[PDB]
Amino acid sequence: AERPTLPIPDLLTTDARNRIQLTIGAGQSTFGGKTATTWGYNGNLLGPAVKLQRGKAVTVDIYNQLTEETTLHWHGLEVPGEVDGGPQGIIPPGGKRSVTLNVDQPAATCWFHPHQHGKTGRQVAMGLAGLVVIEDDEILKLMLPKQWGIDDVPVIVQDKKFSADGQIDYQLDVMTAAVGWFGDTLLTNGAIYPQHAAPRGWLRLRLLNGCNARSLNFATSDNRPLYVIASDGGLLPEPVKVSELPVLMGERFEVLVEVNDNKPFDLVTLPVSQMGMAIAPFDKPHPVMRIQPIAISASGALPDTLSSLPALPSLEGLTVRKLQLSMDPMLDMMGMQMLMEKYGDQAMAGMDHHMNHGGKFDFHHANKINGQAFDMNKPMFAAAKGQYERWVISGVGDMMLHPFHIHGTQFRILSENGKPPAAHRAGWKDTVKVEGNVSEVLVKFNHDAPKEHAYMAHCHLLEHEDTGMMLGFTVG
Ligand SMILES: [Cu+2]
Ligand SMILES: [Cu+2]
Ligand SMILES: [Cu+2]
Ligand SMILES: [Cu+2]
């Protein structure tokens, strides 16, 4: 049979009341011919792409039609805590909340997803994620590929696993609290190995790693290069040519790739050196989508310069915050042992060479920052507003992968896990790798967040977040 076409999320803008409506609800999807209950925004799975313009405000009306509470967080958007949609941003089942977003950051591809306390991994795994396309005046002048769903296409890549009855098989247990929830089936905008027909010339892909726990590494099947033009928080100063592009959970990159007549190629993900993630079929390069060239000229450009990246400032005298990530040693060792028992040696491929003892020992609060599992009622500190700070994040003490994300900002990486960042990672980021080493970022918060609607800082391996690896902080 033929591959399905890549689903394209609808690109949504405001009505004359300046409103965008998002409904959160459950329905059915089909995977490999089997129905499954899934959740979506404005549909049964995933969500639309909300289009925002710098300097304009929009109001979003969010209707929770699930039977459990949820929240809606705009990952990558710099907005006050009151509208950030972290765990305090509860939307009751059957209720509605509205937020007004005053967009004030450069063009970028951001995304949105639930942030329900202790249940974010399940709610994302069940299907909830959407996209945010921010435009500004600068980016349109570049004449990049811009025809949505033709030569400018979002690519949301996620894994799932399913039970024999076809349902999504999600669990937050001792194993997944240690190594994450991951599966054996790869979805691309919700479809299994789709094709996308693209015109000859440049094709812009807006890549999102929407997995709960799996890191990805994109490349092409015939080794044509990818030209990175943007990271989480917007354009790079100039394109960066790569042969492979690692993408951590929750990160976005935009790339241009050449499309030539008569030569289809796949976007693939290459095996990664992360525990659990190289079990077949992910022990080998895995297709993401087939690009099918069409003999119609594509009009977009790859300009030599994209934007101006400001210099880093002097670091002397800036506030230095320390954030020590940790995992309880026993629950780390127990969850790694369960992984090894289940899958054997392959669960460490590519890596470097039972009684109840009470709530003190519960895995639901085993992961921590600065010795504390996330306490929604106690922000750990009060950060300055409008001031650069250096945040130092350490994963020394365990060897798991922690893509560390800070709400309310786009930062600059100073050190990523003990090395200067790669050139395509040196611009605006909202995530930094922490794995057995130490990272340092330069952050500035332009908006307030009070104790009642605090910003989060957390590992974006969702099962770690949900079992305590998160803190709240206020600004202003
Ligand atoms: Cu996120
Ligand atoms: Cu976020
Ligand atoms: Cu983590
Ligand atoms: Cu978050």
Curated annotation (Swiss-Prot):
CDD domains registered for this protein in UniProt:
CuRO_1_CueO_FtsP (cd04232), CuRO_2_CueO_FtsP (cd13867), CuRO_3_CueO_FtsP (cd13890)
Q: How does activity depend on pH?
A: Optimum pH is 6.5 with 2,6-DMP as substrate. The pH dependence of the reaction as monitored by oxygen consumption shows a broad activity peak between pH 5 and 6 and a second activity peak at pH 8.
This protein's UniProt keywords: Copper, Metal-binding, Oxidoreductase, Periplasm, Repeat, Signal
Q: What is its EC number?
A: 1.16.3.4
UniProt cross-references to InterPro entries, sorted A to Z: Cu-oxidase-like_N, Cu-oxidase_2nd, Cu-oxidase_C, Cu-oxidase_fam, Cu_oxidase_Cu_BS, Cupredoxin, TAT_signal
Q: Which cofactor(s) are needed, names only?
A: Cu cation
Superkingdom of origin organism:
Bacteria
Residues binding Cu cation 3: 115, 407, 458
Residues that bind Cu cation 2, according to the entry?
Answer: 75, 113, 460
Role: Multicopper oxidase involved in copper homeostasis and copper tolerance under aerobic conditions. Is responsible for the oxidation of Cu(+) to the less harmful Cu(2+) in the periplasm, thereby preventing Cu(+) from entering the cytoplasm. Probably primarily functions as a cuprous oxidase in vivo. In vitro, in the presence of excess copper ions, exhibits ferroxidase and phenoloxidase activities. Fe(2+) is an excellent substrate in the presence of excess Cu(2+), but is inactive in the absence of Cu(2+). Oxidizes the phenolate iron siderophores enterobactin, 2,3-dihydroxybenzoate (2,3-DHB) and 3-hydroxyanthranilate (3-HAA). Oxidation and thus inactivation of enterobactin could protect cells from the interaction of enterobactin with copper and play a central role as an interface between copper detoxification and iron homeostasis.
Q: What is this protein called?
A: Multicopper oxidase CueO
The gene it comes from is: cueO
